[PDB]
Design a protein around this ligand. Structure first.
Ligand SMILES: O=C(N[C@@H]1c2cccc(O)c2C[C@@H]1C(=O)O)c1ccc2[nH]c(CO)nc2c1
Length: 167
């Protein structure tokens, strides 16, 4: 038993809810919140900008030190950093950005990072301003992640569509 509330069970291990991931994080304080990162950890907009804003820019400060030491992530890759006031840890995961022309096949590799963590609060990778179909992202999530994932979906109208179209 865990503390996530109101989530709709999709599969053995995947649950979904219409909520702002930042607000979910603030309430739950999960062990791991997933950020929809880019390779430079520049948290400007979407999930990343919203999470970073809630940390008063501490996420960005930590991220800039990470990049200065280690260089950029790979598309499909990840790193574990602090969760600041939102979670114990933040797993920064880079899904492919269709609006930048990146290979959608890398979405499965991105979701594989979730399997290193027993339980996660997460967004659908590559969706929103990353340009991919959220219905596709949810399918890849369910078919790739084996650990327990609680998906927060910002847009209420998309959430209803994701549920109604789920196979
Ligand atoms: O961009 C965000 N989420 C993506 C998003 C956004 C809009 C339509 C979409 O189809 C999608 C798919 C993505 C998802 O739901 O995971 C996001 C999430 C929380 C936010 N809190 C604030 C505060 O101002 N801003 C936010 C932005």
């Amino acid at each position: 038993v865990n503390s996530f509330s109101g989530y709709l069970k999709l599969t053995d291990n995947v649950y979904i809810k219409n909520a702002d991931i930042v607000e979910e994080a603030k309430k739950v304080k999960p062990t791991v919140v997933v950020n929809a990162a880019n390779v430079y950890l520049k948290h400007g907009g979407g999930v990343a900008g919203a999470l970073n804003k809630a940390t008063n820019n501490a996420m960005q400060v930590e991220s800039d030190d990470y990049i200065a030491t280690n260089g950029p992530l790979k598309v499909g890759g990840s790193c574990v950093l602090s969760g600041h006031n939102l979670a114990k840890h933040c797993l920064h995961v880079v899904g492919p950005n269709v609006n930048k022309g990146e290979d959608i096949q890398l979405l499965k590799s991105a979701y594989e990072n979730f399997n290193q963590h027993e339980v996660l609060l997460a967004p659908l990778l590559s969706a929103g301003i990353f340009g991919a179909d959220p219905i596709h992202s949810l399918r890849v999530c369910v078919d790739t992640v084996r650990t327990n994932v609680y998906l927060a979906v910002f847009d209420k109208n998309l959430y209803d569509k994701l549920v109604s179209s789920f196979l």
